[PDB]
Structure formats: structure tokens, C-alpha cells
């Protein structure tokens, strides 16, 4: 014979609990990647982005190593 249902209350805050939030952790990860890719794409034109980030990527990085010949540069 059972006298009482068997349960506990999990910690919660603002209607969130750890079981639920843990399911969404991967999703935040992917959104972070999306935001990262997007942000980087938006500043791909910025010379510093090319110099410090994009030109350092192996193989692909030579896409962003471009020199104007001294003969063609007024400045």
C-alpha cells in the first residue's frame, strides 16, 4: 500500500528549470554560431578583420591577402 505520491520540487526561477534549460543549451550554441558567422560576414570588408582573422585561416586565407601594385596606388 502506498500512502503518498512520490515527488520532489526541482529548483526553478522565473519559470525556468534545469531539465528544460538543458534541452535548449545546444540551440543557444547554434544561435551563437549563426550570430558569429553573421557578425563576421558583416565586417568581412573591414581591413582589420582581413588582417587579423580572415587571412590567417588555412588554405582559404589567401583570398584576403591582396596587394595593390605600387605603380597603381596614388596614396
Amino acid at each position: 500500500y502506498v500512502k503518498k505520491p512520490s515527488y520532489k520540487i526541482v529548483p526553478h526561477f522565473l519559470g525556468f528549470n534545469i531539465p528544460t534549460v538543458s534541452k535548449w543549451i545546444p540551440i543557444f550554441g547554434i544561435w551563437g554560431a549563426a550570430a558569429g558567422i553573421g557578425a563576421l560576414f558583416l565586417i568581412e570588408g573591414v581591413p582589420r578583420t582581413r588582417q587579423d582573422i580572415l587571412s590567417k585561416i588555412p588554405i582559404i586565407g589567401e583570398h584576403w591577402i591582396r596587394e595593390i601594385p605600387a605603380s597603381d596606388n596614388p596614396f
Binding site: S71, D72, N73, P74, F75
Partner: protein, 55 residues
């Protein structure tokens, strides 16, 4: 190549009477001339400087 030749016509014929006031020497560079050729054209001329120390 036609642009470069046309510059030469401008310089030797039209420039006696006509200005080209909106074009700077830097504008020719990498269009009709190298940096050095355009610098040589600029350096042959005299322009007004800022006044000296006695004004």
C-alpha cells in the same frame, strides 16, 4: 590605351585654352599612368605654398 592617348591630346592641344579643373594628378594613376609618371607630371609644375615665416 585610348584614354592614355586622349590625355596626350588634351595636354598638347586642348590645354592651351581649356581647363580640366576637377581632375587631380592622382586620378590618372592606375587609369592612364603609373604613380611615377603622374608624380613626374605634378612635380614639373609650381603651385602656391603656404606663406613663409615673414608671411
Amino acid at each position: 590605351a585610348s584614354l592614355r592617348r586622349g590625355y596626350q591630346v588634351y595636354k598638347e592641344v586642348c590645354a592651351a585654352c581649356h581647363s580640366l579643373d576637377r581632375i587631380a594628378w592622382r586620378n590618372l594613376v592606375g587609369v592612364t599612368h603609373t604613380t611615377d609618371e603622374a608624380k613626374a607630371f605634378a612635380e614639373e609644375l609650381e603651385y602656391d605654398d603656404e606663406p613663409d615665416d615673414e608671411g
